[model samples]
Target chain A: FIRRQINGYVGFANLPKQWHRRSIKNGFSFNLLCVGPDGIGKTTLMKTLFNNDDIEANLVKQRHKVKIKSYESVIEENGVKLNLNVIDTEGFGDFLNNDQKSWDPIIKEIDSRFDQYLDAENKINRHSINDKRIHACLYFIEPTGHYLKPLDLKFMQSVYEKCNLIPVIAKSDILTDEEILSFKKTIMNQLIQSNIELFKPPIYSNDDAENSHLSERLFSSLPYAVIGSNDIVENYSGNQVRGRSYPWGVIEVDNDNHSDFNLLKNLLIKQFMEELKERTSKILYENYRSSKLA
Target chain B: FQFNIMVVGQSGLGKSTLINTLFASHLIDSATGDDISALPVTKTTEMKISTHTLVVRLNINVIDTPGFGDFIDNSKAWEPIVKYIKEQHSQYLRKELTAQRERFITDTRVHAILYFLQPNGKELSRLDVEALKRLTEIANVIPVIGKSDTLTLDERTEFRELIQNEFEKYNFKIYPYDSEELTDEELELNRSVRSIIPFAVVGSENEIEINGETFRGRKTRWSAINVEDINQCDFVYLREFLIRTHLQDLIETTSYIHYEGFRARQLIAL
Candidate 1:
C-alpha cells in the first residue's frame, strides 16, 4: 500500500506534522525543467494546470537559441497545494533555422544546472535541511501515433543520466492506437537496454495475469512524488471501472483541441507533488541524519 | 467536413485580398473605379466563412490561412497549422459525411483545393516548392494563375501554357484556378492590383448514377456500368478532368472521412 500525506506543501519547513514520523536531519527543495517540441501545447497546458495568472506566452520577437521561459505557479487540487517552479526550455528537435545546433547544448545546460542545484543544496543545508535533489526531468513528446525518432531516443539518453526522467507522450489524443503502440514498444525496448538509473520497468507485462493490473502499475510508476488521492486521479484509468486510487493523471494531450486542459492539470498534479515530497523526505532523512551523524 | 482551407502565394499576388472578395468584405476599397487592375497596397491573411448554403448540410470550415513564403516569421505558422490538422485528423474527418458527398459526388477526394499562382511569374520560389511538398501530403493542391483578367484571352492561354510548362518541368500537372465566375466581391478584390482576372468555375457539372434496372430494361447496362458504354465521348467531356486528377488526394481523404473502408473488411467478413 502506498502512504499518502500532506494536503498542502509550502516549501520545506512546513513538512506536515503527519510526516514527523520520519527523522529529517535537513530540509528539502527540488528544481525541475521540462523540455519538448514547440506548439505541442506544453506551455498552454502548464499554464492552465499551474493556474499561472502571470504566465504570459513568450513570443519570440527574434529567434534565439534556448529561449528558456521560466514560471512559478502554485496548483491547488484535491485539497493539496503544490508550488511548482518550472523552467520550460525552448522547443527542441525543430529542424528549422539553425535549431539543430541548439538542442544538445540546451539539454546539457539543463543537466549542468540540475547538478549545480544539487551541489548547492548539499552545502547550504549543512545537515540543517534535507539534501535537495532534482526530483524529475519531464520530457514531452507529441503523440503522432508514430515510432520514436533517432533524435528522441538520443534525447532520452542525455536526460536519463542527468535526472529521474519522465517520458510523457504529449499529444496522445491525436495518434492512432497502432501509432501509439508502435511508439510505446520502441521506447520501452530502448529504455530496457539503456543504462539509465532512473528508468523504471513496467511492474507487470501486458500478458501479466491481469491486464488491468498492468495499467495500475504503469500509473503508479509515474516519476514525480505526489500527495493526495485527488492530487493524483484525473484521466487515470486503471483496473477499477469506477475511478482510480488517485486522480486520473493526464498522460497525453491533444494540441488542436483545447479541451484537454483539465486532464493535463490532473496529470501535472499526480506527476509532481506527493511523489516528490516522499522522495525528498526519504533522501533528506537518510542523507542528513544517521548517515551523516555516523 | 471541416475543410481547413489555407491559401498561400507571393505576398503581392493578392491572395488575402482575393479571399476577402470571396467572403464579401470591402476591407480594402480601391478604385481602378472598381476594376480588377488595382490590388490592395499590401498582402495579409483574412478568414471568413458562410454556412448558409453548405450544399447538403456539410459543415465546411474554410480557414483562410496567411499566404506562405510571404516572409520568414509568417511562414513559421505553416508548421503549426499543419501540426494542428494532423492532431485533429480523426475528429475533423468524422464530423460530417453526407454533406461532403453532395458537394463531391463519387467521393473522389479533396472536393476542391484552390491554389492561386501569381500571374506571369518567371519561376516558383524555393519556399513555394517546400510548401507544395507539405500541402500535397494531405490535399490536392490545384494551381491557379491569379490576375488572369488583366491578360488578354491570348495572354491567358499563354499564361496557362507557361504554367503547364513549369509544372511539366517539375513532373507535375496542376489544374488552374477558375476565375470565370468572379462575383462582384472577387472583382473588387483585384481593384488595386495591376492585373485583375476573369475565369470560370473549374467543375460545374454535378451528377449521380443510380444503380437499378436501367430505363426500360436496357440489357442491364452490360450487367452494371458497362465500361465501354460509360466511356462515351459525351461522358468524357462532362467532367473537368484537370481538377479531378489534380485534387484527387483531397477528394479521397474527404471521401474516407466518415467511413474507414479498411475497417469495413473485417465487419463484412464477420
Candidate 2:
C-alpha cells in the first residue's frame, strides 16, 4: 500500500515507444522482473542500474511508465524500452506478519500475472534470442538471519517449480562473515528440507561498468554464466504447480549504504555481457566451426 | 576517586535498586524528591546519560541507554554518536581521516554497554535478539542479570548456567550482579565491563613521569601518531575531529591524513 513516494523507481522512457513495437531487431531482448518484498529495494536496484534522465523524460511523453508496477518487465534490445506491465506487491506485509488472508492475494496475483504473460508471449511468439523463456529471475533478501517461513517456503516452492528463482540475499553488507554464513546455512537447509536444490547465482561483484550503465549492469549480471547460455528449461511434465519454467539461482548484493553499490551494478553488467559473448561463441563453434571444416 | 556508576535495566527488574546498592547512597534523594520515586525510566529512542561524573580513576560517562524493548527506535539514535566520532577522528584529531566510519561506530569501539535481563527466561526476545544483533554489529555487549537478590541460594550460586549459552549466541560475556552491595565482589562482577574493551584512557606524559614510557616518544607531531590505533593516538583529538568535520572537510589539513591511509587496507580487505 506504500506507494513509492521518492523518485526512486526508475522506468525507461527513452528509445521512443517504437522500440517495444517492433520485433527483436537485435535478435536479443532482455527483460528483468522485479519480484520481492515491498520496500526491500527491488525497484531502487532496478532504477539505480538503468536510470537515465533523458530516457525517463521521453518515456513520460508516451505515458507508458508507472510506479510500483508489479511484474513490471523492461525490454533491452537495440536500444531499451521499459515495459510497465508488472506489479511489485510486498509479500504478505513484513515477512508473514499478515496471515493466510494477506498471503492468499499475492499467490493469486503471481499466478494471474504468470498466465497473462504466458498468454501474451504465446500470442506474439515473444522470445529473447529465439528462446521463448524469461532469462533469469533476481530474488532480493536482507542478509539478517531469518529463514524462509512456511508461507515463504510454500510460495518459493511454487515459484521455483515454475521459474529460475535466484535467491539473492540483499543487504548482505549488514552482516558479518559468520552471520552471513549462518544465514545461508539456515536458508539452504530449509530449502533442501523442502526437497529443492537451492541454486546460488554468481555473486555480482563490484565493477566499473556498474558506475556507467548501472541498470544495464544489474540486468546484464543476471544472465547465464556462459554468456547468454540459453538456460535449459526442463519440462516439469506433470508437476503439482502450474506455471511457466523460470531461471532460479542466487546472487548477492550488499544493501549497505556505505558500500559502493555501483560495484554490484558493474559486476552484473560484466556477467551479462560476457555470458552473451561466451554463449554466442560456443554456439558458433559447435555449428559453423565443424560445418566450415566439413 | 568515587564514581557515579549507573546499572540500568527494565521496570519490573531492579535498575534503581542496582544503582542504590552500587552508590551505597540513600534510596531517597533530593533529585527524586520521593523515597521510592521511580528511577528515570530509560527513554524511548536515545541512550540517556546519567553523567554520574563521580570522581574516580576515570570520570565515567555511565550512560544507561534505553533497554532492548525499545531498540528498534534506538538504532537510529546511535547514528549521531557514530557520525560524531568519525568526524572527530578525521577533522580535529587525525591529519587524514578515513572515509568509512564503521570502526568508530562499531560495538567493538564502545566503552561499555551493560545488557541486564532476568535470569532463566524462555530466550531473548525479538527486541533483545535485534539488540544483540545491532550491538554486535558495532561493539561488544556485556550481559548481566539484574534483581539477583530475588533468586534462591541455589539459583544465585549457579546463575550463569543457562546465560552462558545465550552469551555464546552473540559471543557476549556474562557477569551477574548478585548482592545489594558494591563490594570487592561487585567490582569483580564489574571487571568484564572494562576488560571487554580497552577504553582509551587519556594520560599525559607528565602524569606518567619518572618511570613510564611515552607511547608517542618517537613522534614529534600529531601526524606521526597512528590515528587508526586509538590506544596510541589521542581519543580527545579523535573526539574533536569527529565533532567538527563533514563530508566536505579536507583530510590533509590535520593529523588524520594518516587515518585515511587505512582505506587501501580496507580496499584490500574487500
Candidate 3:
C-alpha cells in the first residue's frame, strides 16, 4: 500500500508492449494537407513516401477541373496499420487572374475538420470522436532558387499557425548542392522577414546525446530539400536503389548524401508522428476551439 | 540587318543569363533593379539598346521588363509589354506617313520576343499561356525553357512535349510562319524546327575547360552542362535558328507580316 516495488515476476513491466499491441490493433490515422502550385511534384513525393499509387492517381486523371479533394487509403506493414488521408488542392495557382484566395479552401478545410470534431465532442455519449483535423500541412515550395514568391509567402503565413507547416523544396534534384544551400538560406531569411512561425521538432531535456543530436540535425534541416522517385535504378555498385537517373549521375532518394528524403521520413513518421498529433491537439486545436466558443 | 529582340518572363527564371549566353557577349547586365523605372502606381517596362559591331555588325535593341507574374494581383502584368510593342509599331507608322522622311527610316520595331518558360518540368502555367497569347500576336514569339540545366534528358523531353501540346491546344501562332514561296528544303527545315519549338536551353557566361577544349558551361556540384552541346541542351539549335538560318526570315516576317498588318489597320483607322 505504500508504493512498494512489485515482485520480479509481476507483469507491470510489459505495459508498454501491451499498449503497443493494442494501438496496432486499433490502427493509427493521420490527416495531412498538401498545398502547392500545379505540377510541383506533391503527389509524386507522397506516393513515393507511402508507396501508394492511389495517393494522387485520381488527381492526374481528373486534371485541373476538379476542386479540393481528399484521398484516403489504409496501408499496413508488419501488422501495424495506418489510415492516411491526403487533401490535395488542385487548380490552386493555375488561374490567369489574381491568386490571392488560393489558400482559402485550404484554410476552410482545416477549420471545418476542427468544427466537425468540436460538434462530435459536444454529444452526451462521446465514445468515439474521429480526429479528422489536419496534423500537418506539407507546403511544397517551387525550386526557383530565388526568394519566395508572393503566393508562397502569403499561403505559408496563412496556414503555419493552423497546422504543423513543413515546407519542402520539391523536385530538388534540379538544383545543385550549392544552389540548394543558398536557396535554403534565402527561404529561411524570407520566412523570418515575414514573421512566419514554423514548427520546430521537440527536444527533451533528459534525452541522451545521440537523441539530442538527431533532433538538432532535424531542426536545422527545416524546409527539407527533397527529391522524390518511385523508380529504382542500378547504381555503380550494382545495387538497385530508388532514385532519378541522369546522364551525369544518379540521385538516390534514400541516400543522405543525395537527398533529404531519408531525414524527412525519419522526422515525419519514425520519430515524431506522435509529436505532430500532440502539437495539433494541444496547441492548434485548442486555439481554434477557444476562439470559436468565445 | 539590325534586329530588336525582347525577353520576357518572371524573375529568377534566368532571363538575363539566357540573353547574354545566346550572343556570347555581356550585352546585358545580369542583375535586375539596376535600371528600374519608377512609374505611377503600376510597374513599367524598360528598354536598353546595345549597338554590336560583331559578326553581323548589327545594332540590337534589347527590351527587359521587371519580372511579370510575381505579383499577387497580376491581372495586368502583360499590359506594359503589349503597350511597348504597339508604341514601336505606332512610331514606325508615323515615320512612314511623314512626307519629308529620311531616305531610310531607322527600324525600331520588335523583330522577335524570346519568351522564357520556367524549367519546372510541368505544364505551361496560366501565366505562360496568357502572356504568350498576347505577345505572339504582335511579334515573332520564340518560347525557350530557361534554366533548363535543372531538368534531365527524360524530364526535358516530357516537359517540352507538355508545353508543345499546350501551345497546340491554345492555337498559339509562334514564329517561323509558313510561306508558300519557301523552297522545299527550307520548308522541311522549318517543319523540323517547328517540332523543336519551346527549345530547352541552359545558359552560362562562365567558361569551363572540359577534356581540352573550353566551352561556355554551368558547373554544378554534380556535372558540367556544356551550353552549346547539342546532346546537353537545345541552346545550339536556338542559336543557329536565331543567327544562321532564320535571321533574315525573322526580319522579313516582322516587316512584311507583323508591320504590314499594323500599317493596314492604322491606315484604316485614319
Candidate 4:
C-alpha cells in the first residue's frame, strides 16, 4: 500500500458527484425478511413503514405449514428511487404442536437468495446481475413480558449470522413501561447467553457527539418495543398523528416518549438503510460466496 | 376434599402470575433466568396444599405444568398433559380393583385445567384448538386469554367472539359444561358462563393505588390495570367461577364425566 500526496489539485474530488449521479440513475433495491407468529403486527408494521396501502397481509389459514411470500414495491422521493422487497412467513407458528421444520424454508430462502446472486456473478456476462440478496431481517418477538421462547431462541440462532437481524417487540402497548424494561433486559441477556448477534448501527471516529449519542441510544433500545398504526388520531397536544386511540389515551407511534418507533424508522430507513445494504453486500455476501467457492 | 387444578400454556403467557393472583398468595414462583431449561419434557405437577381454614375446609392442590407450545413442533407437546390426566385415572382404577385397597385412595386427579391463550386479539391457533380438544376430553378445561390488559374492550370483545365462533365450529366443549341434572336456573347460569368461556384475564401480584384506594393491579406507561376490575378484565368472574361458584362441581364433574368415561373404557378392555 503506497500513500502519496498530490502536488496539484486532482479530479478525484469530483468523483463523489459522479458516483451520486450514477446511484441516482441506477436507483436502490433492498430485500428485507420479516418473521414472527401470526397477528403479531408484521404486516401492519410494513404497511406503516412504507406508507403503502396495497402491501398485502398474510391471511393464509393453513396451519402446520410454513409458506414464504415476497412482495415488491417502488417509491421515489425527489427523483431518488427505492425498490423495496418485503418477505413474509405465513403459517409460521400456527402449527399443531410441531414447528421444528418451519424454519427450514426460511433458512433455505436466505441461502437461495445468496445462491442466486452467486450464480449471477459467475455468469459469463454479468452486466445485468440482479442483487436479490437479503439486506436485513426484522424478527418480531411477542410482547409476552417474559423471557424469550425456545422457538424465538432457535430462530435467532439460525439467522443471526446469515443476515442483519433486528428484533422488535410487537404490539408493545400491552406491557407497562417497567415490564418492557425488565423484559428487554431478560431478552438481551438470553440473546447474549445464546450467542445471537443483532444488528448494531456503526459509529465512525469522525461522528459528531450528537450523532454518536443517537447511535448509542439506538443500540441500547435493542429488541425495540414498537406499536404500528396506519390510522391517524388527535394527540393530547391537538396535533393529528399516526397512533392508536384507546380509552385511556392515544399511543403515538412516532413519539420517542411513547415508543421506539422513531428510532427504528431512522435505523431501518432514514439513516442506516444504506449501511445495512453495504454490510450485506460486503460482509454477509462475501462470506457466503467464499464458503460456496471453497 | 382435595381439589386439584393445573395451569397450562406456552411460555410468557403469565401462567404463574395468574395462579398467584388467583389465590392471592405467592404459592409458586415465576420462572426466570435458568429455570427455562429445566422445564419438564412431561407434565411435572407441583402441589401447593392450602393450610388455612375457610367456610369449606378443603385441600386445594395446584399443579403447574412447565410452559408448553414453545417449540418449533408443538404437535405432541400437550400429550404429556393428556397422559398425566389419564395416568391418574389408571392409578385410581388399580386401587379400586385391589381387594385390600384403602377406604380412600389419595386422589391425584386433575379436576380442572386453566389453559392460557396468548392475547394477540385473534382467534385460537391450531395448536390451541387441538390441545383444548384433548385436554377437555379428560379434564375440565377453562381457556383464558392471558395478559389481556394488552387489548382494549372492543378488541377483546371481537377476539372473544371470533374464538367462540371457532369453538362452536370445531365442537370443542369448554368447562362449566351443560348438564341434564341441572335445573332451569342452573342451565341459565351455565349459558351465561359459556358466553364468557374464554375469559380474558390480566394477572398481577403487585398493588397500586388509584385515588388513594389500593388494589391488585399493574401500572403501565399509559394506564393502571386493576386485575379485579370488571371493566378491565374478567379476572373477578373467573375467580368466582373457579373458587366461589363451582369448586365442588368441578371435582364432581371430573369424577362423573372425565373419570367415568376413562373407567368405562378400561372395564370394557378387561
Which numbered prediction scores highest in DockQ against the true structure?
4
| Candidate 3 lDDT over residue span B101-147, tens digit each | 87888888889888888776777776777788888877899998877
Q: Residues A162-258, candidate 4, lDDT per residue (tens digit)?
A: 8999999999887889878988898899999999988889897977999889988888999899989887888778999988766446788877787
TM-score of chain B of 4: 0.91
For candidate 2, lDDT tens digit of each residue in B1-270?
212222333432334433333333333222221111232344243344444433224333344443323221233433443333244333422323446544543111123344555433235533455555544333324455543322323433354544555556766432222234557854663454333211121212111111354342112101122222343423333233222221012112112232333344444676
Deviating ranges (above 4 Å) for candidate 4: A1-14, A57-65, A96-100, A234-240, A247-249, B31-35, B41-55, B94-106, B121-123
lDDT of each: 0.41, 0.37, 0.79, 0.81
TM-score, B chain alone, candidates in order: 0.45, 0.43, 0.91, 0.91
- Model 2 spans with C-alpha error above 4 angstroms: A1-31, A51-68, A71-86, A95-97, A117-136, A149-151, A197-294, B1-270
List clash counts for every candidate, in order: 40, 56, 0, 11
Instruction: By TM-score, rank the candidates, best first.
Output: 3, 4, 1, 2
What fraction of correct interface contacts does each candidate retain?
Answer: 0.00, 0.00, 0.50, 0.59
lDDT of 1 at A34: 71
Q: Which stretches of candidate 1 lie over 4 Å from their true place?
A: A1-30, A47-64, A76-81, A95-100, A118-134, A193-216, A219-268, A271-294, B1-270
lDDT tens digits by residue: candidate 3, A227-263? 8878798876788988776665677888887778877
DockQ of each: 0.02, 0.01, 0.47, 0.49
Measured over all alpha carbons after superposition, the RMSD of each candidate to the real structure, in angstroms, is: 21.9, 25.7, 3.5, 3.2
Tell me each candidate's TM-score.
0.40, 0.32, 0.91, 0.90
Cand. 2 TM to true fold: 0.32
Question: Which model, 1 or 2, shows the larger DockQ?
Answer: 1
